[PDB]
């Protein structure tokens, strides 16, 4: 079904406001539009370089630019499905919340504490507990069920919290009724446990044929001001947005099932025009579209060379640069980084390949199965030496064009670092029937890691 | 067990039974079919069933797109409208909420004469 | 080609049965079609006398006559015209019939 000019209206901000739509004007614009009439860019991971497990904190700061005037220091807050709690750290710093609750989802220690919050309280100083956390039993959490709603209602003190946030990941094969039950549970918790000045933020990823638009038109009644926010640091190919609801008018107790029946009787099942409108705004106002594409013609943007001011807002009392430890996981490079990593260490693998030939045994099979493995290591490390320290002319562009195709190419010839090898060892490598070309396919996750490594090589070239 | 949990599990079970019915119907209609490219009353049919096999729902906008692509041939548009009426008759009225928006609208319409 | 027909009758019977178990709504729409497919399973031939007899049995309920006529029209339209006489005598004559309006 998938086969455009429509524009929207301490720690100093408002230089980072995201595009937001008022809900009713957007709904009338989609309903009046006739529309009809009959990729996979991952460069957005180049700009995210703070946050080790998760780098979503950028989004959080932009959302805070619409929250901070509408809330006082609230000393409250409930967070659902944080996933290592990086956004919790960012929102707790920027909104001065005293206490924080954390739900997530538990797969059967049995008390899963967030890793990034633990690293933040370790690096900041002496931090005790910070977040309250829940039981950790499998029936506990699993938002969208009876036990979750009963356990969360039984704990939060009877309409006390002021900032409610949901960041549940939606799978592509998730059923729409299950997602509607989850959103109805979040809404029932928001009405029962939320006060008058409560602000609710829900991460929504609409699809064609989903029940998202009926839920949005339903939730526009209880909250006086409902807006839909497209963060600038999100991936523009994905249709993710944040629904922000402010100034709840009343607190009532109703079951999620009655809410679900009302949304089904509403019979609104989204439009292709809404998906196209979200995609158009996120393409026009992405962070790539405002300061330029990072790959260019084999050159890094000057904006990524020095730390951007959003990263300077983040780095004060929040997270750390994820460029280190990424080299350790990817190219096995030390943190000290005085070219002791790579260089001679790369040569060490060649020294192994110097004596690997050794010229009723396991010679024909296993030797090949080892040889490729060694070459694979060299391949990754060689691209590291092009990205991290060497010059960018005629090689970074080739690396990006090969990565977009999906392959990493290493050529075993005169090349680079073979001149440092011994003449006998160079003769041993060249003599055999090795192809002088070796490709290795990369996955999507490794491509994201390589784009982050480009983003950190930008800081190293500074 | 509360009524809400039982209702959720009942909806999941109805979805599983509907998926099994769609798979068996697709196999039957493919077996019937295999023994210009203007499609007819069954060549239309399986396409909608194929959308039900790949877990994407029947929608009014899809019907408008399908009318616009088949627009020069009026007999073929009649064939596709009759085929969606066949699917309205085959699927029980409880599960038309699961299929989408086309079939609850087409359940009301009926033939004037045999 | 009888092996191709017979196998599809098995698959249609499985599909209509699994639809029938989950329905919040006399042999009405689909239920009458299950009866006709079960008669095809028993190697019974669709004859004019059987349809006339079924009209005589269900004569007081007019809505159920409309339901059985629509279900026989479903079975007429879904089956190809080459195998259509191998189904029986009813289905080419019902292929001749058509709707006036949607």
């Amino acid at each position: 079904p998938g086969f455009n000019v429509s524009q929207p209206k301490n720690m100093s901000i408002k230089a980072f406001r995201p595009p937001h739509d008022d809900v009713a004007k957007l709904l009338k614009d989609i309903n009046t539009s006739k529309h009809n009439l009959p990729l996979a860019n991952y460069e957005i991971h180049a700009f995210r370089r703070i946050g080790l497990n998760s780098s979503a904190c950028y989004k959080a700061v932009e959302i805070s630019t619409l929250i901070r005037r509408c809330l006082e220091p609230g000393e409250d807050g409930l967070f659902l499905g944080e996933g290592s709690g990086s956004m919790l750290i960012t929102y707790k710093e920027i909104l001065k919340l005293s206490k924080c609750f954390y739900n997530s989802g538990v797969s059967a220690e049995l008390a899963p504490y967030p890793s990034e919050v633990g690293l933040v309280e370790h690096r900041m100083g002496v931090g005790n507990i910070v977040k309250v956390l829940f039981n950790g039993r499998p029936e506990v959490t699993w938002v969208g069920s009876v036990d979750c709603f009963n356990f969360i209602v039984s704990n939060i003190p009877t309409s006390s919290v002021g900032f409610i946030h949901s960041d549940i990941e939606t799978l592509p094969d998730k059923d729409t009724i299950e997602k509607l039950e989850e959103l109805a549970a979040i809404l029932s918790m928001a009405l029962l446990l939320g006060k008058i000045g409560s602000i609710l933020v829900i991460k929504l990823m609409p699809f064609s044929g989903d029940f998202v638009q009926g839920f949005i038109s339903y939730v526009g009644s209880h909250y006086r001001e409902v807006n839909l926010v497209y963060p600038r640091y999100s991936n523009f190919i994905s249709t993710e947005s944040y629904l922000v609801m402010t100034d709840l008018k009343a607190n009532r107790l109703m079951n999620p099932e009655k809410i679900k029946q009302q949304i089904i009787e509403s019979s609104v099942r989204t439009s292709p025009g809404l998906i196209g409108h979200i995609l158009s705004i996120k393409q026009l106002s992405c962070i790539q579209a405002i300061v330029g594409d990072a790959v260019s013609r084999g050159d890094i943007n000057p904006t990524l060379k020095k730390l951007t001011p959003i990263e300077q807002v983040l780095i004060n009392c929040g997270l750390a640069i994820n460029g280190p430890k990424l080299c350790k996981e990817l190219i096995h490079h030390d943190v000290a980084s005085g070219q002791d990593g790579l260089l001679n260490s790369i040569l060490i693998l060649y020294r192994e390949l110097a004596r690997f030939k050794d010229n009723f045994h396991a010679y024909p099979v296993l030797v090949s199965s080892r040889q490729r493995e060694l070459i694979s290591r060299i391949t990754r490390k060689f691209w590291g030496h092009i990205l991290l320290y060497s010059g960018n002319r005629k090689l970074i562009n080739k690396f990006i064009q090969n990565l977009k195709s999906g392959y990493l190419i290493l050529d075993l010839h005169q090349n680079i670092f073979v001149k440092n090898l011994s003449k006998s060892e160079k003769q041993i490598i060249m003599t055999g029937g090795l192809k002088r070309e070796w490709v290795f396919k990369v996955t999507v996750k490794e491509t994201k890691e390589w784009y982050k490594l480009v983003g950190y090589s930008a800081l190293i070239k500074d | 067990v509360s009524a809400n949990h039982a209702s959720q599990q009942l909806d999941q079970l109805k979805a599983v039974h509907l998926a099994s019915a769609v798979r068996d119907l697709e196999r039957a209609m493919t077996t019937l079919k295999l023994w210009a490219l203007g499609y007819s009353v069954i060549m239309f049919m399986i396409t909608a069933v194929k959308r039900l096999r790949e877990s994407k729902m029947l929608t009014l906008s899809w019907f408008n797109q399908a009318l616009m692509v088949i627009a020069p041939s009026q007999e073929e548009t009649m064939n596709l409208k009759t085929a969606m009426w066949i699917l309205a008759n085959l699927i029980p009225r409880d599960m038309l909420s699961l299929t989408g928006d086309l079939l609850p609208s087409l359940w009301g319409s009926g033939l004037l004469m045999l």
Side-chain angles (χ1 to χ4, degrees), chain A residues 196 316 340 352 388 415 447 453:
Chain A
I196 306 296
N316 304 335
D340 300 345
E352 182 182 356
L388 282 294
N415 209 9
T447 306
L453 197 57

Side-chain angles (χ1 to χ4, degrees), chain A residues 187-201:
Chain A
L187 180 55
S188 55
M189 294 178 195
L191 304 186
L192 188 61
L193 321 173
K195 51 162 159 287
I196 306 296
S198 69
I199 308 183
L200 165 68
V201 177

Side-chain angles (χ1 to χ4, degrees), chain A residues 301-316:
Chain A
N301 290 139
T303 60
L304 291 200
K305 198 164 300 300
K306 190 188 177 180
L307 289 178
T308 75
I310 192 66
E311 290 163 356
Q312 297 162 1
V313 173
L314 281 170
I315 194 66
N316 304 335

Side-chain angles (χ1 to χ4, degrees), chain A residues 243-414:
Chain A
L243 189 64
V244 181
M245 292 144 279
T246 303
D247 297 348
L248 172 58
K249 67 183 299 299
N251 307 344
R252 302 192 324 267
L253 171 57
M254 52 186 191
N255 60 100
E257 192 76 19
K258 185 56 190 175
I259 308 178
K260 189 180 64 177
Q261 305 298 328
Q262 291 155 335
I263 301 177
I264 297 177
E265 296 294 327
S266 77
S267 305
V268 193
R269 296 189 99 255
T270 74
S271 299
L274 175 72
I275 312 299
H277 185 81
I278 290 177
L279 279 164
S280 301
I281 297 171
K282 290 187 63 172
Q283 182 185 356
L284 195 146
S285 196
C286 188
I287 195 71
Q288 308 191 33
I290 198 65
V291 296
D293 286 359
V295 299
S296 80
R297 297 205 181 184
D299 305 320
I300 298 92
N301 290 139
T303 60
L304 291 200
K305 198 164 300 300
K306 190 188 177 180
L307 289 178
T308 75
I310 192 66
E311 290 163 356
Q312 297 162 1
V313 173
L314 281 170
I315 194 66
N316 304 335
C317 300
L319 277 296
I321 289 159
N322 60 33
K325 182 266 290 181
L326 183 84
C327 304
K328 284 200 156 304
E329 304 296 323
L330 185 59
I331 49 176
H332 309 287
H333 197 296
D334 201 18
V335 182
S337 301
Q339 293 180 356
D340 300 345
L342 310 174
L343 205 55
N344 304 344
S345 185
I346 300 191
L347 298 176
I348 290 173
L349 297 166
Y350 282 124
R351 309 303 271 266
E352 182 182 356
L353 195 60
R355 66 184 182 277
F356 181 75
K357 280 75 176 175
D358 265 338
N359 291 337
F360 66 110
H361 290 289
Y363 62 102
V365 176
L366 289 194
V367 164
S368 61
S369 303
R370 191 147 79 94
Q371 209 164 29
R372 283 280 287 181
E373 200 270 340
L374 302 181
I375 297 176
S376 179
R377 295 178 176 178
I378 302 175
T379 307
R380 296 215 305 267
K381 285 188 173 184
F382 177 67
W383 283 122
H385 188 81
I386 302 189
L387 287 151
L388 282 294
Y389 311 107
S390 178
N392 66 91
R393 300 182 177 180
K394 298 164 300 180
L395 293 169
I396 290 308
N397 202 10
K398 184 188 307 177
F399 164 73
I400 294 166
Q401 291 153 357
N402 292 348
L403 187 68
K404 285 180 176 181
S405 304
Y407 320 112
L408 280 193
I409 313 181
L410 175 73
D411 287 3
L412 288 178
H413 68 299
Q414 310 174 4

Side-chain angles (χ1 to χ4, degrees), chain A residues 1 3 36-38 144-146 175 177 181 209 211 255 257 260 267 269 272, chain B residues 2 4-5 7-8 11 15 51 56-57 59 61 64-65 68 97-98 100-101:
Chain A
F3 190 114
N36 294 346
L37 60 86
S145 72
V146 175
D175 189 20
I177 308 291
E181 294 173 5
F211 276 99
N255 60 100
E257 192 76 19
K260 189 180 64 177
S267 305
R269 296 189 99 255
Chain B
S2 72
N4 303 346
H5 202 44
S7 70
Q8 295 182 0
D11 297 346
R51 298 173 84 269
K56 281 159 290 293
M57 326 322 296
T59 302
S61 62
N64 302 347
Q65 165 196 2
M68 288 184 289
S97 55
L98 306 173
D101 282 342

Side-chain angles (χ1 to χ4, degrees), chain A residues 11 21 39 46 111 117 122 160 239 290 348 368 394 409 453 460:
Chain A
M11 301 161 65
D21 292 332
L39 292 178
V117 179
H122 286 123
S160 73
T239 49
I290 198 65
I348 290 173
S368 61
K394 298 164 300 180
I409 313 181
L453 197 57
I460 295 171

